Amino acid sequence: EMIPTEEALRIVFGVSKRLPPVIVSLYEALGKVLAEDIRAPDPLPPYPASVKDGYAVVASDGPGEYPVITESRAGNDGLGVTVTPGTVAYVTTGGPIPDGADAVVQVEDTKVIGDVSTESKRVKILIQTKKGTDIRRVGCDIEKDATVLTTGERIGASEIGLLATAGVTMVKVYPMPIVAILSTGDELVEPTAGTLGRGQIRDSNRAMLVAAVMQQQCKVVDLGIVRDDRKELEKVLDEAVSSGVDIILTSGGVSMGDRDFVKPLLEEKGKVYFSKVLMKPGKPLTFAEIRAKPGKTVLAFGLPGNPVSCLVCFNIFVVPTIRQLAGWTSPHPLRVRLRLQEPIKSDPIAPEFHRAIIKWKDNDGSGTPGFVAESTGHQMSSRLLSMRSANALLELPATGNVLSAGSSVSAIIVSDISAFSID
Amino acid sequence: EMIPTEEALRIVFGVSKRLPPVIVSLYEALGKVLAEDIRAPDPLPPYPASVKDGYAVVASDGPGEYPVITESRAGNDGLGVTVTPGTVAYVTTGGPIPDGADAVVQVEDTKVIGDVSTESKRVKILIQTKKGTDIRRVGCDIEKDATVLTTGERIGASEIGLLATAGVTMVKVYPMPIVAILSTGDELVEPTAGTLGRGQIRDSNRAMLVAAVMQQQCKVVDLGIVRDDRKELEKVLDEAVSSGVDIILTSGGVSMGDRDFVKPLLEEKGKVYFSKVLMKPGKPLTFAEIRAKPGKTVLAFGLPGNPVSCLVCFNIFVVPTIRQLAGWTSPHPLRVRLRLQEPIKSDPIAPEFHRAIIKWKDNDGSGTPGFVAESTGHQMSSRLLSMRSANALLELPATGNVLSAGSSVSAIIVSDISAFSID
Ligand SMILES: Nc1ncnc2c1ncn2[C@@H]1O[C@H](COP(=O)(O)O)[C@@H](O)[C@H]1O
Ligand SMILES: Nc1ncnc2c1ncn2[C@@H]1O[C@H](COP(=O)(O)O)[C@@H](O)[C@H]1O
Ligand code: MOO
Ligand code: MOO
Ligand SMILES: [Mg+2]
Numbered sequence: 058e059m060i061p062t063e064e065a066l067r068i069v070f071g072v073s074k075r076l077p078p079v080i081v082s083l084y085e086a087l088g089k090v091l092a093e094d095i096r097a098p099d100p101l102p103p104y105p106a107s108v109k110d111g112y113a114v115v116a117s118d119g120p121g122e123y124p125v126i127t128e129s130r131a132g133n134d135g136l137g138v139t140v141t142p143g144t145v146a147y148v149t150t151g152g153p154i155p156d157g158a159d160a161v162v163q164v165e166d167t168k169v170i171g172d173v174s175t176e177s178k179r180v181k182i183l184i185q186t187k188k189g190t191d192i193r194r195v196g197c198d199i200e201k202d203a204t205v206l207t208t209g210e211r212i213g214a215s216e217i218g219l220l221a222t223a224g225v226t227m228v229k230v231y232p233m234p235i236v237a238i239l240s241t242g243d244e245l246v247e248p249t250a251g252t253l254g255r256g257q258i259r260d261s262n263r264a265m266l267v268a269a270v271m272q273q274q275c276k277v278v279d280l281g282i283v284r285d286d287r288k289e290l291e292k293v294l295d296e297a298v299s300s301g302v303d304i305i306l307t308s309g310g311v312s313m314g315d316r317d318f319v320k321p322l323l324e325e326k327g328k329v330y331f332s333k334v335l336m337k338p339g340k341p342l343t344f345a346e347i348r349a350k351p352g353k354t355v356l357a358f359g360l361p362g363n364p365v366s367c368l369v370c371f372n373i374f375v376v377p378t379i380r381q382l383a384g385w386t387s388p389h390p391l392r393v394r395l396r397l398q399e400p401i402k403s404d405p406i407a408p409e410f411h412r413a414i415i416k417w418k419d420n421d422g423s424g425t426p427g428f429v430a431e432s433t434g435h436q437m438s439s440r441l442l443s444m445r446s447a448n449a450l451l452e453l454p455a456t457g458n459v460l461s462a463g464s465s466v467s468a469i470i471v472s473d474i475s476a477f478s479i480d
Numbered sequence: 481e482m483i484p485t486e487e488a489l490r491i492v493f494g495v496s497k498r499l500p501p502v503i504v505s506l507y508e509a510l511g512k513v514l515a516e517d518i519r520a521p522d523p524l525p526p527y528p529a530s531v532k533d534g535y536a537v538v539a540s541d542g543p544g545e546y547p548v549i550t551e552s553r554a555g556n557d558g559l560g561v562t563v564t565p566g567t568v569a570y571v572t573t574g575g576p577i578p579d580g581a582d583a584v585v586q587v588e589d590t591k592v593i594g595d596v597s598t599e600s601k602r603v604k605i606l607i608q609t610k611k612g613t614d615i616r617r618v619g620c621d622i623e624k625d626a627t628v629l630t631t632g633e634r635i636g637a638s639e640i641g642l643l644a645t646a647g648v649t650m651v652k653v654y655p656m657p658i659v660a661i662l663s664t665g666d667e668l669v670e671p672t673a674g675t676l677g678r679g680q681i682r683d684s685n686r687a688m689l690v691a692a693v694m695q696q697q698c699k700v701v702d703l704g705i706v707r708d709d710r711k712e713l714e715k716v717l718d719e720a721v722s723s724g725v726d727i728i729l730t731s732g733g734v735s736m737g738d739r740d741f742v743k744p745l746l747e748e749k750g751k752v753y754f755s756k757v758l759m760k761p762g763k764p765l766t767f768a769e770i771r772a773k774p775g776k777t778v779l780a781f782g783l784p785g786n787p788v789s790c791l792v793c794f795n796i797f798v799v800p801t802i803r804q805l806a807g808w809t810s811p812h813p814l815r816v817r818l819r820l821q822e823p824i825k826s827d828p829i830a831p832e833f834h835r836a837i838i839k840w841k842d843n844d845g846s847g848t849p850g851f852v853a854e855s856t857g858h859q860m861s862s863r864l865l866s867m868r869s870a871n872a873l874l875e876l877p878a879t880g881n882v883l884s885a886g887s888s889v890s891a892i893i894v895s896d897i898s899a900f901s902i903d
């Protein structure tokens with residue numbers, strides 16, 4: 058019972074539930090989705106503020122020479138002083154406008170007159186300004202009680218700046234899921250192994266997945282290598298489910314071998330929604346939901362053992378699940394359209410997620426700017442070098458035809474689009 | 481002496497030098513740029529490995545019933561057993577191929593014959609296979625001594641997987657720069673302040689920059705609020721320069737006020753390359769290089785105080801500097817072309833970095849897929865709400881003309897393109 062990827066994703070989305078919100082500190086809120094609206098407790102600026110370094114004037118006075126009656130840069134500077142017609146006040150950018158002044162003339166349109174500090178301060182205003190010029194009225198950037206951030210908004214640097222503006226240092230957010238990761242196989246040895254014994258390989262999926270989960274900003278619970286023994290894998294899965302994690306990722310032990318126990322163990326512990334997906338690479342992907350005994354849900358992905366299939370299934374299915382649990386309203390990956398830089402043979406049986414290195418060009422080959430893709434070469438699921446530098450997965454339909462250079466395909470972007478190397 | 485942004489970026493790039501490489505552990509290498517090539521010490525697979533769960537056969541035998549002479553899943557399974565013509569061996573995916581077998585027939589093309597474990601094991605091979613089918617020969621994924629990663633390559637999840645495959649757990653990389661951050665101003669109060677006194681605002685730039693630097697994966701040295709006092713700012717800058725940081729970010733104290741000491745202090749401590757940039761927002765941006773006394777270079781950015789200008793200058797100038805110091809060969813931000821969803825008035829004096837929310841659409845308005853942009857509204861440099869959710873900066877030339885909806889502009893992508901919300 059092999060299901061299409063679109064259905065497998067819908068099933069995963071339907072089962073995945075946003076985590077309960079928590080309260081975190083300002084810097085812990087970075088990267089998280091807001092679980093409450095944020096309202097400004099005071100206006101910005103809270104006082105009428107100068108846009109410029111210069112002089113606060115009565116605009117109707119016009120060009121002329123005037124005494125400087127106060128200097129206003131911050132705090133109580135100029136408190137109680139009224140700028141009346143025929144006077145001016147020195148101001149710096151962000152300085153409070155003294156009462157009575159209704160415009161600011163930038164310092165470049167003024168000239169200091171008389172002996173610097175050996176006579177009372179006088180300045181020549183060189184222009185005719187207009188009422189309100191270069192003054193930020195109270196609340197013109199942010200009004201008191203305005204909503205500056207809303208529930209469901211992801212917190213980036215400017216949102217941290219808005220929380221700080223509003224004096225919020227404890228924030229209600231959706232947390233990231235905690236993810237347990239294990240590898241399976243009698244053939245595996247730790248990546249610290251030197252000379253390999255006959256029939257041994259280094260466990261590469263576990264470190265790869267730990268890294269992938271770290272890129273998604275989740276806490277990792279590293280459960281190590283598990284051997285192809287049903288009782289042993291049951292014990293580790295039972296320990297993982299009762300530990301408080303939200304997602305368990307296993308790799309391997311999910312194909313057709315007589316010692317592949319992931320599927321029967323997930324069927325016994327919880328509910329397996331699927332164990333076969335019509336995709337290349339990634340056919341053995343298994344997804345299950347387990348209820349931890351009181352009491353919460355744990356999502357389990359029995360990822361394929363083949364290194365490419367493992368990472369592709371992580372990118373397509375686990376990344377949107379992490380985002381959904383973390384409260385993202387748009388957990389789907391970015392899909393763009395792009396032109397192939399070389400010919401690519403699609404698979405005749407399953408739609409292929411072909412690894413590519415994509416870049417934006419001024420000419421994508423059709424005379425207009427656009428993304429272009431180069432294949433990473435041989436796409437065998439055992440060839441982790443096919444994932445090297447791959448920032449996208451080309452979605453090739455199961456036609457079996459050769460897609461020529463210059464033809465357009467849909468591509469899933471799997472790595473930070475703002476970290477893309479330019480053409 | 482106001483210089484174009486293109487020149488200001490060239491000056492910064494010319495002064496910025498990659499940091500000395502360091503040795504880090506496997507998981508610390510994630511996100512860093514490799515400073516050495518990585519070669520596979522053994523092949524992958526190191527033994528001829530089955531692609532399938534099934535039976536290792538002599539392909540020339542063809543369809544028929546055969547005794548199963550061994551079972552090979554991992555390690556020393558089947559060591560010393562030779563599959564001769566007229567025999568087969570059970571194998572699981574990744575299991576070593578016994579000597580003498582030259583093809584694998586997947587279990588779906590076989591049938592077990594006789595009483596399960598109450599008679600010696602026999603299997604019917606249902607197809608005529610071909611020599612080499614479903615076997616991974618030694619080194620077919622990675623050859624012994626092949627270079628699997630090269631100097632200058634950024635380490636993502638698949639690169640961590642390749643390091644683990646190759647048994648590398650200590651990696652030579654370029655480190656991230658350490659960044660000191662301070663705010664300036666007599667008007668500032670901490671973001672924990674409740675009711676604000678007259679002429680006070682909360683310091684929002686510092687937390688915003690700490691967050692921005694944390695998104696760039698750099699260590700932050702938070703030097704707090706500094707008042708508009710030359711001796712005090714000199715002391716903090718001198719302490720920052722001798723602390724071992726690589727970059728200092730200040731904000732404010734760089735306009736035309738009589739208590740703006742950042743520029744004269746940077747001129748005194750080191751070499752100021754520029755202090756005026758032809759851009760909107762961000763005109764007061766100052767850049768300097770200071771030599772810390774023995775002995776290393778410290779880059780200083782006197783960022784503008786206006787919150788928008790501060791973050792825009794961070795995105796345009798500081799992000800590529802961090803990347804250059806961290807050894808990125810492509811530190812420039814991603815620039816794409818896109819269509820405007822609404823009309824935008826460009827500035828008549830300076831090229832504007834207009835904040836936008838961009839998304840990829842199936843129809844960008846011209847009948848072909850592409851990025852589209854919505855303005856974040858009023859672009860005043862004091863209005864941090866104009867940065868809210870902005871994932872790009874539209875590069876508008878200094879024409880002063882109204883760019884109509886549907887016209888195309890260049891846009892700098894400033895936030896993870898793989899975290900873009902879909903249309
Ligand atoms: N942690 C791992 N690291 C590298 N390769 C793996 C890992 N787990 C399984 N494999 C390989 O992936 C393939 C499928 O594994 P399995 O699903 O257990 O049969 C076999 O060739 C395994 O040797
Ligand atoms: N850390 C900060 N947070 C928020 N606003 C700031 C900060 N530093 C300076 N400003 C404002 O930015 C503008 C320019 O500051 P300056 O360059 O010091 O004149 C003034 O309106 C300041 O009040
Ligand atoms: O069975 Mo796969 O789709 O090569 O991991
Ligand atoms: O002087 Mo600006 O360019 O509004 O920070
Ligand atoms: Mg296995």
Ligand SMILES: [Mg+2]
Binds near residue numbers: 664
């Ligand atoms: Mg200031």
